[PDB]
Structures are given as C-alpha cells and as structure tokens.
C-alpha cells in the first residue's frame, strides 16, 4: 500500500494565447512523508521460498 | 497434441516490437499539448516552513 498524505491545491497560470501552466497553490493541513507498507510475515515466507 | 515446440524467450521479436510501439505511443501523445520552454529562468526559492 502506497500513500501520499499531502493535500495539494493546483493553480492554473496563463503563459500565452491558449497556453496554460498548472502550478501548485499550497498544502492544506500537515506536511507528511509519502510511504509504502508491506507485510513482514508474507515477505519472510516469500524470501524463504526464493532462497529454496 | 503429440507436438513439442522448441521455445526461446531471450531471442523473440515480440519484445522488441512491443518496446518500440510503447515508445511510439508515448511520443505521439505529447505533440498537441503545451511546450514549457519559457520556464527556464532564474528562480528564487525559499523554504516552505520555518
């Protein structure tokens, strides 16, 4: 399971006729690190099978 | 039935054609949309939180 806790806001900027640039306004709440979770026991079994 | 074909996975041409086709599909979908080359300027950056 992978997650990106930050709550971003996208802001649009006009740089020419019909040309738009999508910047980032700010973040609502707290700034937290993105991360991924794996289960330890299942990974242990998988590594044991791979070693075998 | 009654058949045994000699297979090889390291020398087949399907992988090369799939690679070049994926590259071509990636390239042709970036033509219509915006070309960001006024953005190469001198930025001025600060920390977001203090």
């Amino acid at each position: 399971n992978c997650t990106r806790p930050n709550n971003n806001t996208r802001k649009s900027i006009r740089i020419g006729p019909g040309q738009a640039f999508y910047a980032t306004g700010d973040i609502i709440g707290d700034i937290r690190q993105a991360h991924c979770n794996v289960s330890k026991a299942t990974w242990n079994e998988t590594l044991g099978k791979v070693v075998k | 039935e009654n058949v045994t074909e000699e297979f090889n996975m390291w020398k087949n041409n399907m992988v090369e054609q799939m690679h070049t086709d994926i590259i071509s599909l990636w390239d042709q979908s970036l033509k219509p949309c915006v070309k960001l080359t006024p953005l190469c300027v001198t930025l001025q950056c600060t920390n977001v939180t203090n």
Partner: antibody
Amino acid sequence: VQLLESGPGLVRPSETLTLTCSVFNSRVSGYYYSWIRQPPGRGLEWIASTHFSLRPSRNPSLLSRVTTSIDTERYQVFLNMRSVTAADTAVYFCARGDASGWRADYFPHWGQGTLVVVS
Amino acid sequence: SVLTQPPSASGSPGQSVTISCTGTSSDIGASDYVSWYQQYPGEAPKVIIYDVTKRPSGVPDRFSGSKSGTTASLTVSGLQAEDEADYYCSSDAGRHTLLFGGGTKVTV
C-alpha cells in the same frame, strides 16, 4: 505552534483597530485562523475567520467593518477592523483549526490575548 | 447570542451536573458541529468536547454530549474541587458561521 498577539494600547473613539498575532512553528497557510472576542464581564463572540486558499467568513453583526488579511512572508494575520464604538471594547484571542486544515468549527490552539480598551 | 444556557449550576463532590444548551432548528439541528469549551478566570479557553460526542486527546473522560433533538446536554460525573470553571457551548449556523452561548458557571 505559538500564537503571540499584539495590539496598540488604548484606541480613540474614531481611530481604527489594528490587531496582529504572529505564528511560531507554523506555515500561516493551510490552516483556518479565527478571531474571538470577550468583554470583561462575559463574552466569547467570534469576529472573523480566514484561510489562504479557501473562502473566509464574517460575522453578520460586524460584516460592515471587518477587513482581515494574512501575510505569508512574515507569518502574520491582521484583523484591522474599523468604525469602532465605545461599546465593543473587549479582549481578543486568535486561534487556529486542527491538523485537518479544513475545519473552522472548533479551535484547539489559542493565544494570550490583548486588552484593547477603548477610550 | 442565539444559543442560551442557565446562568449557573452547583452541586456536591461525587455528584453529577447536567448543563443544557438550546438553539433553533436551523442552528443545531442542521449539522453535528457542536463544541464545548472551559476557561479559568485567568486563562484562555480550551476545547473539551468537539463534534458533540468526541473528545480531544489527553483529557479526562468525564464529559459527554447527547444532542437531544435541537438541544445539547453536557454531563460531568465525579467532579472535584478543581473542576470549577465556565462552560460555553458553540454551534455552526451555516456559511462557517458559529454562534456561542451565555456560559454556565459551575461552582462547588
């Protein structure tokens, strides 16, 4: 997070109020910042609420003269109400919402407060 | 101050006190955003009950909220000598507009 509030002494009957509370260990962005006021006897009526990128709100009984804003470079928030009367003299607190950043219902963090007696 | 409370309440140690906060249907019956605060005479208030039936971390679990129709009730059970403080009720009245109450000074 620390909220340090400041206001100038005693105010004239026609001179406007300028209130500012600096934030410490916070971004002054992504959080709802609100002002609440209580007269010496009893109180806790809320003046206004602000956010950087979302819609603010004002008290209908004071919507006429509430012009509040925020400053990101210096991490400050300004009430800057005007057209003051002698009857609204009271002490002010500034507060911010929870870690969610989108709720202005309850205000966990608060500040010291200021007297701001009207002369 | 649309929301109103009884001016004061009292009791004895080891007893329970119930405080009622009332409002119109559009005020309290619209949503569950109801909060209760306490403040000492020389200090700023702090949140004790938020979202009617939830409490902040690191507080004694001796307070509660019922949302009885359009009226909210706060119960304090097993009060002590240092639980004497004013109790304010606040609620949301649409467009991020809060409405407070007159407060209830609990003495013992």
